[model samples]
Target: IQEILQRKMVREFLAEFMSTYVMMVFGLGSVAHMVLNKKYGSYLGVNLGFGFGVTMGVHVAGRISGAHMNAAVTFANCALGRVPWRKFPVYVLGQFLGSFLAAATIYSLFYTAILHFSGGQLMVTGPVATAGIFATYLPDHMTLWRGFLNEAWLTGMLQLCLFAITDQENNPALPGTEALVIGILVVIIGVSLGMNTGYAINPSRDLPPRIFTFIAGWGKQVFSNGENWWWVPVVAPLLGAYLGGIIYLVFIG
Candidate 1:
């Protein structure tokens, strides 16, 4: 019995590790690719790169793990009874761990290429660039409170729109319609507010890779850049997502 239990736990751990790894590799890798391409032509492609990840992750993992791949989503889904609270810790760990490994993979893949191409200059920062590429964090002109609000507003809208699109009862056109709505939302948010912050509506989207950026590339600026703006993405999006889900429940449902 003891041997069997140990084997089971090991299997479970590997499952969680692999699941999370796949989710993050695709998502984070897409961002690295988009940032590299922005220098050649249009920079707006990064939004699609990520939006594409969200929608595809959903379609791909929805059946097995709900494609959550997001701690905030997993928490809220628990509140909604869509996912169990008991498994919350495991899911969260898996998601963040996946993102961590994924970021490393992206860094590994692009490190040499960056050294060759950009002369060893890092690609991302705390939205403090010299009028060229898009940074992953908020800009310096914005204050802490403004960053919080923009993050909350955009994330709320993102979750709200996602709920609307995927709702079985509320949506008549959910299946194929979700991708377009997601792509459009990302574009609008990026165009309108991305200039303000990097518009990381999903905290998981930016927070995990952010630490990697700080440690390996840009250093600690992400923490103190514009008054420790890290919490804005972490808190605002969850609040927005919660409120958005609640609002949809009350109004739409």
Candidate 2:
């Protein structure tokens, strides 16, 4: 066990897993509470939940694995050569597993409330749907292409701001405070851009939980809803992050 723990990649993977788990539990728990017990939480609370969740996750793993709870961030770093390409899969795997488990944890914790709210239906759409607690869903008026653009644009902005926040020579956030700044950034983004598609700027954050909802009884509609929207959060963020990285390289990096 000690020998396995000594492996650099294994250590990093574990760090990512634990960090993502921490973030997801906080974020998803808030959403579940807000949806299941309407009087308990507001949109601002949800935003704050995710924001501080990110802060705590960073504090947990920043020194060990850079605390990239989002796959898009890891992909951006890899594409920009900040992280080795070989580590990309490991990072994503860790993040996905962590997120999946967090969803399971939240599900069990809120199982009674969920069943009561949805009357054991486990739906993905309609007025009482509970799936949105785990993954994003497009608004009724949103088209697929528009939702895609919304996610892509929001993630691009996120990557751009993330680069700026961490850039050592660019008047970045003070040492030890990057996590707080990033958390605030998340809150601001949530308040500004979240309504369209929940600002799911991380494939790791969205997909694994969506998969969990699928397995836990939300059924295939979790994938089929919003005009087959499952792939947008996964694919758009990667494209946006890479573009954002390139933009930073050209203008700022």
Candidate 3:
């Protein structure tokens, strides 16, 4: 349709693309510094980095694209008829590409650090390795079912809280402070719910970076680690987002 060809459409796509790009740079960069240097930060700092990254991304793209940096959020909005179905692919493609590119950039920025950390042996499952730098892996105690529930529950809470902040009929966040509130929400989620599966509640946030690791010599283990856990973040979060939307419509919004 002619609507899809408009410059406005292109700009929206780029807004999501660049917004996610910047967000992940701050995110993965912080993780790299933390995991590699070990003297600069801790797990709490990683949570803060990712949370603040989302906040900044939302601020950059919220005006134009609603700043659905996660594919799960975009998919949920489309399902709820909040976004045009025709534009769904544009949003997801931009988000995935942005995440992938950001992972690549972080890898480049921390190439020496990674090498030093790994001592030339890139691993997907070692305590001192760099796989956790870009993508998430489940802890040994986490089963796939529990991992699924963890991601879904956290993502659901994410969307539910978002509705609380964005819904005008309720005690909504003030216009200028919505992003800050959302950032704080992520910080809470990361600190409280992030430990088990690293709080990967976004498909775009998890999958592309995982894909890059697969190609970047983490090997087939990238797909094999944690009992084939790669798909949980992608599928469960979509379900969780929709669940959250349903809850919002039913009880809150």
Candidate 4:
């Protein structure tokens, strides 16, 4: 029990929280400037923003915290016995709260800039239902279900590739191939499904931020897009994460 307590869930949690906070502060702020200021923000730039943010966070806290920024990663790892079930709630709580606090901080920091904005567009995670600012260049008409499936498939592939490359037991050891694998996968997701809901491909990468985005006044417009947008992405990645783990155990093991 003491060991569980020392799981350092809170520290792990705070690390993810700060990492995302930094990502949003730089990435989202850049995009917001584009929409509100009308002279910045590039699709490629945003993709790189996400990619670099995730990679740096992984490098920083991965060894200590497992860098499980995405709930999908956590869920999948737990099923694979990489993480314990009893710790699931604590981990997720940390992840969600960390993300929320980060997002809130980002919004608050930009409140003054927001005051000068043209219209009352609600905040959104990534570019899903975004208006004015923070919009990524993707399918402008994508529904929530479509976004959900896109994320699930993308996440599944990411996990499968990760196991195949990083899990020495699952894949032959390469001197230093994990980063290359993950980076290439990120590029691929950006090119392929990026047009559809930014292809977040990770539950925490999108879900927790989406939740806070909803709570942060964007909820009003979120459902107008479709209830699926809200629920599907949240649930589908969970399916992908669980199935990804089982696949690893039944087939890889």
TM-score of each: 0.78, 0.97, 0.95, 0.76
Q: Candidates' lDDT values, in order?
A: 0.63, 0.91, 0.88, 0.61
Over the stretch 2-98, how does candidate 2's per-residue lDDT look in tens digits?
9999999999999999999999999999898888886897999999999999999999999998998999999889978889999989999999999
- Residue 239: error of model 1 in Å? 1.0
lDDT of 1 by residue, 138-202 (tens): 55576788888877777777777767767788664557566566556666666666767777676
Candidate 1, 155: how far from true, in Å?
A: 1.4
Cα lDDT of candidate 3 equals: 0.88
Write model 4 residue lDDT over 1-253, tens digit each, in one string. Answer: 6665475666666666655555545545545554555456566666666666666665666666666767777888887778788877766776666566665666777766665563455544353235424322235576656676776777777677667767766555464445545556666667666666666555554555555655766655553444445456567777776776677667877
Candidate 1 residue 3 Cα shift, in angstroms, is 11
Cα RMSD of all models vs. native, in order, equals 4.3, 1.0, 2.3, 4.5
Question: Candidate 1 or 4, higher lDDT?
Answer: 1
**Model 4: how far residue 237 lies from native, Å:** 0.6
Candidate 3 residue pairs in clash (backbone atoms < 3 Å): none
Best by lDDT: 2
Give the count of colliding residue pairs in each prediction. Answer: 0, 0, 0, 3
